[PDB]
Amino acid sequence: PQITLWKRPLVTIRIGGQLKEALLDTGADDTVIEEMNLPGKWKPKMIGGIGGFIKVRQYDQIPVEIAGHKAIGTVLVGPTPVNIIGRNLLTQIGATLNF
C-alpha cells in the first residue's frame, strides 16, 4: 500500500502466532517489540535510541507477517513504548520512502 504520514503509520503484524500493532519506522535500524514470550533462544543485547540505552533479548530468524507480507529476521524484545518495525524487516517487504 501507499501510506501517508498524517497519522502514525501503524499496521497489524503477526508474530509468535499473535497479532499486534506496530509502527513502520524508517528511523529504526532494528525491530524492537514489547516484552512477550517468543519461542526460540535469545542473546542479551543493548541498543540505544533518543533517551538512552535499554537492555533487550535478541531473537534471530523470527517470522513476522507485516500487513500480509512475510519477513523472517531478527527481532529485539524489551521495554518499549510501541512495537517498532525497523529497516531490517522493512527492506525484506520492499518498503521505500517516496516524495
Residues belonging to the active site = 25
Q: Is 86 in the site for ligand PI6 (CB under 6 A)?
A: yes
Nearer Cβ to ligand PI6 (82/95): 82
Choose among ligand PI6, a second copy, none what residue 52 binds, the Cβ cut-off being 5 to 8 Å by kind: a second copy
DSSP 7: S
> Taken in order 9, 46, 58, 79, is the CA torsion positive or negative?
negative
Nearest Cα neighbor of 95 from 11, 6, 18 is 11
What, of a second copy, ligand PI6, none, does residue 17 touch, CB below 5 to 8 Å by kind? Answer: none
